[PDB]
Design a protein around this ligand. Structure first.
Ligand SMILES: Nc1nc2c(ncn2[C@@H]2O[C@@H]3COP(=O)(O)O[C@H]3[C@H]2O)c(=O)[nH]1
Ligand SMILES: Nc1nc2c(ncn2[C@@H]2O[C@@H]3COP(=O)(O)O[C@H]3[C@H]2O)c(=O)[nH]1
Ligand SMILES: Nc1nc2c(ncn2[C@@H]2O[C@@H]3COP(=O)(O)O[C@H]3[C@H]2O)c(=O)[nH]1
Ligand SMILES: Nc1nc2c(ncn2[C@@H]2O[C@@H]3COP(=O)(O)O[C@H]3[C@H]2O)c(=O)[nH]1
Ligand SMILES: *[C@@H]1O[C@H](CO)[C@@H](O)[C@H](O)[C@H]1NC(C)=O
Ligand SMILES: *[C@@H]1O[C@H](CO)[C@@H](O)[C@H](O)[C@H]1NC(C)=O
Ligand SMILES: *[C@@H]1O[C@H](CO)[C@@H](O)[C@H](O)[C@H]1NC(C)=O
Lengths: 445, 441, 454, 449
């Protein structure tokens, strides 16, 4: 079998191999430095180390049968997969992490060489999850807890090397039953390392030169840790409200424009209420900028999936070419209208055709509140004035006032957009002109 | 004194704003110091009164003889008439703050004795400090230095205010009563400033608060110190991120080009040439493209910056002598700046010709020897070559000689297509250009 | 009957009136749960405030049963459909869980255990909605962001103070050096002293100052290390929030300063003369200081076409209707013409147009002062002012004109002008759907030039 | 000989002159302030100061022969280089750092610290030349704070010696005690005090006299300011490190919100999510027209002919074209990335683009099922006849069969309008292209119109 790195089985294996790597780092430095975790829970550490080595050789096999991409296609032959896995330095890191050094748990510090699986699990979870900033604070707390734990183990090893209870800086005398417990040892070492790496420093001061030097190095490392934590959380907060700051900057610039150009209070509060609607309905980003980073094939497929069943129900586009409808939904433009907004007044130049989506319009009667007919979802208007038929009775002029009752979302197919969409389909252009001429001869010509 | 102060090109006005800033900073520093600390003794009161009279005299001179002479812009036109300047200052919102600052509450010294709380309205003239900051940042080349100095001064002032409030709390609880209050041993201001530094920087290491007033004081001071340190870090981060934004943008686009050329397996000679282009562009221009800078400016300043750079150069060109000035201006606005590396061919002998080259800050060499490498003419900066190729139709003009760049030559290019899209609006100069092409070719 | 609009002002008044007792419930419920003297000494006050909070909670579920929502762009106004749309939400479950009558157990325990009212903290969504509506509604966004961050970290510091006092009560009062002192001492037994010292300890721990006594037991060591890591996270978010405030407060000023430095680097690199350099720099400083630095086309790009047309009408239509050739034109033609109006700014002494130039623009003066100067320099013949216009005959291109499209006079700018430019090509693109109006404009220009010189 | 300031020999000299500058700063302040480091290792400091002064003299001699770019070309006239050096303030700083001021007082050698510009130039050139600029910025910040901690240690020891050893609880302890009298403990306790003061931790003994109070206040303020700037620099570096990831995640979340609001079906939603996961996974997040936007056409043409020219020369109509025409055609190419199963062009579609296959495998499939007739590979092409559009074609700008992607293809499109734009300067080559297309259409299928 061949696994591929983009599937879900690969991410489940990334979790299943990120568990024993974190176990190896954490509990290997703890057992190497504390000497009672290793002594008391010996069968538990034997079981967990056997499980970690089993998952390590299984990771070697999975990396041996993990595919890659050449010429866009996934490679699936195990010989070339094995050679490509072998020529990489990750193969040497895996073999060096699986040397039989068990033939004092510090000999198992080769097992810490599989850190790339933990970093790959963190990267894949960060790109897969839907709470990326919550996972980022989780990863930051995990990294700084690893450093706090490793510094606690280093402090206990240094105080054991100097001597227990010989100094005021080192760990107290473990022959006393209060300082002799493993829980007291680990939690006091963790408290010391936390005070020293959070640059609080309420610890007893050093008395020897190696202790002074270790405390200097520890306080500078804690300074770098605090700077990294603050930088990551600050960039995360700057990313968490970048869209809010962009929309507030746009609102502030438009309000400054409306104050500088002396826009009246009615239009000013109409613009303010429009932006309040645009934020309270989460429409803060425009689709014309949203659909630029996509390729043309996915843009065309999204335009089909949104507008093709709507455009196919238009009476002039019932028997047109599928490629012509593809170009037409590529040239569709969506606009949102406020309540009471006139889409078109009677007597204006008709150069756009609007198809209603998720809205409710009304044909009002000569700048009045009385409505003749109420248009609804899926319907359209302006289907004839944009075709530019010779000998029209109307002459590209709207014969009715259409107001918006609520917030409508129309799709605007312009005259120029239809003319540049009809330039590579001339037979479809003549058929569209024939259908418009037929509709005009039926109703009024 | 002049009848009108420019307030933009007047350095005497910057020095006067410095004097009013020094008076305002003297007030803000030495009103709480004399209010709390016992430094306003009866054998020292005359020097304090002399300094307060000097500060009030500076405030009055600013209110009466300088600010009514400030030029301003009303509806576009610059106002010079001193009566209109005086009414604009009198009906301003700065005059309210100046009057409310210079309100003589010093006459209440006869009633309630010498107390610097009556001079506390003199801290309402902060607008002179703010316009001094604005004018100093405008005259300074690198204003982040003054931003750092201002942030340092704000930190020192808030620590000074914290030292004054701590000495007030020590005198209120009694000097030397508890372990937390000031004991009275050495310099009162220096040791209270030490306490204010260790508290508002959240260092600690001081005696613990004993009573409830001291615990509330220490808690609020530590919270204020957390926010002061946070604002200090934020100000330094804003200064650093604004100071290195252009350099980091240039580095980001250079890394994007390098990642592209590494993804497409482009050879190391081409990658070295691209890196040489990026390095010389950062050395000379300190920006990637001038076109996306100039296209954000209005059309009038675009035309002025195009004229002042290239108009004499194109007015020396014999081809556009009979053409009209607006078409020449449009061809000024539609020029393109390209940088050639040393040894780059700008015109290969036998290739097609479609551009006019204006060499600015460079040297190109016309190779027309018997082997093809001997230098005939070395065209220095400000020259124009290949201008007759702008008028040929279709294929037309082929290049007759190899022209290479000697060093880093920064040519300016006008395409034939660009000249045609300019010429569709200017038919008379179009006829002059075709007649010149017919008589020359 | 009555349906409250969720975008109105009455909904924000109710958001304030329901964000008061939610914050009260959080703060004083953890305080009365952990401090044990606030509950006993102020029992009538807490009965009054809990009854008022429960009344506001049932009024909130009655309000949430009657807020409309947007389908088909219209507000839903029938109480039955509003009630089913509320009942099909998790917020209805959270509200009926926040209104669970645990006051029977609160009365069974003798009104000494306010821990049964901890389900009242399940209405945090009203608090977050009030903060969101205020941060999009108010005029001080950075000041509200600082107030919101201060409120959040004060809730956390208060909860940690209550947790520290509960841990000290569980371990023992005054039995150790880390726990709260012996409350039988009359100085340590005051409730104000208890709360203020616990809040002081919690602030020192959660802000990584740590001027606190050191732990002496394993649970105290573990609580202190967990509190110190939570405190370094809290300090990181405080510094990041204040840094984002500082970065957002001068973002426009930093953008303008980056523009100024870019133009200065261009004028240094291209060796632009010093007079034009100071002219351009003073021009941009004027545009900043008079609050007109932004580009109108880039500012209005985010608006829809209907609001852009309405703003262009409200700014330029009453000024374009005073032009003599556009006196009797179609309303749609005037709307397209004021949509085609592009603005330009001018410096003092800047030439708008010179004599003998091809006229392709029609300028309409707005907040400026121009001057028809002679060819020698600045000798004002007519001083053109606000509301006036020029260049309206040369862009019409009347056939058989003795002046053609040439500018008959030199026009300079005296101060800082803000003209509105109508291009000849934009006029011809706006006249494609109006052939009758194009012929009328041509005939009106022909009549004016026949009156003057034809 | 003229040293080119952009070469590699100049960077080798920048390393060889930034070594004694860092030595001079660090060990000059330590020897000046500790009075035993100068006294014990005296021959070592004589050797190192002789080497540093010889390197300073050679630095003046190298700066006298370093070129500069005037009108784009490097100046090689040694007299011009010497006068241009002489009219600089760096010449004054170098000759002030080379005055013969020269045993137990190494404070006469403090003029040697005036060559800080060579250390700053070395750091700038290393950050320019490296491939890990954020890692070098972290290293440079660490070096700056180490220099500051060391200088504050030397200042604290000098202040303690000026006040008196062991006279206060704040000063350094009595050096007549054999524990405190060691040079290692002197330097290491001064470094410990300086770390605890400059990092604003403050767990050292508090001052007892007014000069000590003033020095500790000034030291805490210098440390707070410096550390705040350090934290702001690290924060700006982190925010510019994850700026591309933040922009790509903003684009992903915007398109996800659009697809959720417009009720896009789950199959197309999964396809767009998989394409975005492929994009970042392949770090192909940047766009070609965005990353080659500011480069000149000469360098863009070199980049384009190093990838596309070998494929464009194999095209049956672009066999014998002109070199300049092939340059214009490889500059007119536009990349298009396709998903697996994406149809490039179906039967009946409008033909206006010629696709060039680069790192992909296409298949000319039939209409009903996936029956691959021809498997088009890397370096192949299709669609030249549709962009030629020869008069008298029965096709009429329509593709014959269907072509879909088997895997992720990066096709490069030469459209018909771009071909006619590149053929404006080559009318004979356009006629030859039309003749070759008419010959191909004559031997396949063509009506005479
Ligand atoms: N004239 C007219 N248009 C109607 C009516 N009901 C819906 N409409 C649409 O309203 C329109 C307004 O613009 P159009 O002239 O473009 O075309 C018209 C029709 O599509 C009706 O009763 N009369
Ligand atoms: N051949 C040639 N061209 C020169 C010389 N001096 C300037 N030029 C310009 O250099 C040119 C390079 O391009 P062109 O062939 O287009 O035309 C040539 C001339 O306009 C010279 O001495 N010989
Ligand atoms: N010739 C002229 N033009 C004037 C005068 N007052 C205002 N104007 C406008 O100034 C103009 C400058 O450009 P135009 O030739 O286009 O047209 C002219 C008029 O519209 C005046 O007294 N003479
Ligand atoms: N019809 C056809 N086209 C092929 C074949 N092999 C490669 N191609 C290319 O596939 C094409 C698809 O588009 P075109 O019609 O534009 O032109 C066709 C050819 O260039 C084949 O066997 N038949
Ligand atoms: C630790 O305690 C034991 C007995 O309790 C004692 O013998 C030993 O000396 C002590 N160690 C130190 C360093 O004091
Ligand atoms: C607290 O004080 C009271 C009386 O002062 C005493 O009885 C009690 O034991 C004290 N508690 C502790 C823990 O010391
Ligand atoms: C330092 O020690 C010496 C000898 O131990 C002693 O004479 C001297 O007084 C001490 N100095 C101080 C300041 O105590």
């Amino acid at each position: 079998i061949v696994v591929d790195p983009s599937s879900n089985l690969y991410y489940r294996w990334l979790t299943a191999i990120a568990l024993p790597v974190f176990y190896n780092w954490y509990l290997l430095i703890c057992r190497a430095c504390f000497d009672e975790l290793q002594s008391e829970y010996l069968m538990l550490w034997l079981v967990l180390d056997y499980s970690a080595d089993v998952l390590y050789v299984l990771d070697v096999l999975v990396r041996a049968r993990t595919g890659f991409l050449e010429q866009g296609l996934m490679v699936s032959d195990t010989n070339r997969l094995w050679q490509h896995y072998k020529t990489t330095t990750q193969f040497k890191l895996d073999v060096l992490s699986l040397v039989p050094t068990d033939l004092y748990p510090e000999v198992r510090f080769n097992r810490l060489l599989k850190f790339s699986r933990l970093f790959e699990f963190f990267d894949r979870t960060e790109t897969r999850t839907n709470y990326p900033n919550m996972f980022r604070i989780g990863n930051l707390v995990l990294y700084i807890l690893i450093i706090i734990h490793w510094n606690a183990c280093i402090y206990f090893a240094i105080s054991k090397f100097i001597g227990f209870g010989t100094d005021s800086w080192v760990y107290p005398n473990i022959s006393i039953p209060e300082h002799g417990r493993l829980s007291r040892k680990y939690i006091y070492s963790l408290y010391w390392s936390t005070l020293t790496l959070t640059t609080i420093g309420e610890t007893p001061p050093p008395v020897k030169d190696e202790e002074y030097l270790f405390v200097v190095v520890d306080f500078l490392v804690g300074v770098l840790i605090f700077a990294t934590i603050v930088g990551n959380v600050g960039s995360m907060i700057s990313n968490m409200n970048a869209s809010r700051a962009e929309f507030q900057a746009k609102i502030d610039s438009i309000k400054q424009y409306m104050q500088f150009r002396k826009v009246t209070k009615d239009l000013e509060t109409r613009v303010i209420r429009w932006f309040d609607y645009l934020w309270a309905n989460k429409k803060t980003v425009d689709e014309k900028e949203v659909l630029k980073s996509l390729p043309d094939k996915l843009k065309a497929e999204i335009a089909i999936n949104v507008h093709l069943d709507t455009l196919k129900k238009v009476r002039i586009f019932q028997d047109c070419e599928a490629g012509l409808l593809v170009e037409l939904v590529l040239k569709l433009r969506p606009t949102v209208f406020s309540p009471g907004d006139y889409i078109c007044k009677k007597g204006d130049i008709g150069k756009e055709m609007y198809i209603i989506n998720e809205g409710k319009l009304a044909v009002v009667a000569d700048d009045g509140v009385t409505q003749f007919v109420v248009l609804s979802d899926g319907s359209y208007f302006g289907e004839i004035s944009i075709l530019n038929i010779k000998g029209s009775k109307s002459g590209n002029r709207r014969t009715a006032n259409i107001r918006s009752i609520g917030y409508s979302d129309l799709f605007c197919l312009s005259k120029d957009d239809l003319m540049e969409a009809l330039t590579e389909y001339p037979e479809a252009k003549k058929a569209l002109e024939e259908k418009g001429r037929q509709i005009l001869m039926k109703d009024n010509l | 004194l002049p009848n009108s102060i420019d307030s933009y090109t007047d350095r005497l006005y910057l020095l006067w704003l410095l004097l009013v800033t020094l008076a305002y900073n003297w007030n803000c520093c030495f009103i709480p110091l004399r209010l709390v600390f016992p430094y306003q003794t009866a054998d020292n009161i005359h020097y304090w009164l002399i300094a307060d009279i000097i500060c009030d005299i500076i405030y009055l001179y600013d209110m009466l003889f300088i600010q009514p002479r400030l030029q301003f812009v009303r509806g576009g036109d610059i106002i010079v008439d001193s009566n209109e300047l005086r009414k604009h200052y009198r009906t301003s919102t700065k005059f309210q703050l100046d009057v409310a600052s210079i309100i003589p509450f010093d006459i209440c010294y006869l009633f309630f004795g010498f107390n610097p709380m009556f001079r506390a309205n003199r801290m309402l003239k902060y607008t002179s400090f703010f316009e001094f900051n604005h004018h100093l940042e405008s005259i300074m080349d690198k204003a982040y230095i003054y931003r750092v100095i201002r942030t340092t001064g704000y930190l020192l002032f808030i620590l000074h205010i914290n030292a004054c409030v701590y000495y007030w709390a020590s005198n209120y609880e009694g000097i030397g009563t508890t372990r937390w209050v000031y004991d009275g041993e050495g310099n009162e201001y220096l040791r209270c400033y030490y306490w204010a530094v260790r508290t508002l920087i959240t260092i600690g290491g001081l005696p613990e608060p004993q009573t409830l007033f001291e615990i509330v004081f220490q808690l609020l001071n530590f919270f204020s110190g957390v926010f002061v340190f946070s604002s200090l870090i934020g100000q330094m981060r804003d200064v650093i991120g604004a100071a290195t934004a252009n350099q980091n943008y240039f580095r980001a686009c250079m890394d994007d080009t390098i990642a592209y050329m590494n993804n497409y397996s482009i050879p190391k000679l081409v990658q070295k040439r691209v890196r040489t282009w990026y390095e010389y562009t950062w050395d000379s221009q300190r920006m990637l493209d001038e076109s996306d800078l100039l296209k954000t400016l209005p059309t009038t300043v675009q035309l002025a910056l195009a004229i002042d750079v290239n108009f004499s150069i194109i007015s020396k060109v014999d081809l556009f002598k009979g053409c009209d000035t607006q078409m020449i201006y449009d061809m000024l606005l539609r020029l393109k700046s390209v940088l050639y590396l040393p040894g780059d061919f700008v015109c290969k002998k036998g290739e097609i010709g479609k551009e006019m080259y204006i060499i600015k800050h460079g040297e190109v060499q016309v190779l027309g020897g018997p082997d093809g490498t001997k230098v005939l003419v070395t065209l220095k900066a400000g020259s124009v070559f290949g201008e007759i190729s702008l008028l040929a139709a279709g294929g037309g003009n082929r290049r007759t000689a190899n022209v290479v760049a000697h060093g880093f030559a920064n040519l300016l290019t006008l395409d034939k297509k660009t000249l045609q899209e300019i010429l569709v609006h200017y038919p008379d100069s179009e006829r002059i250009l075709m007649k010149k092409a017919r008589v020359l070719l």
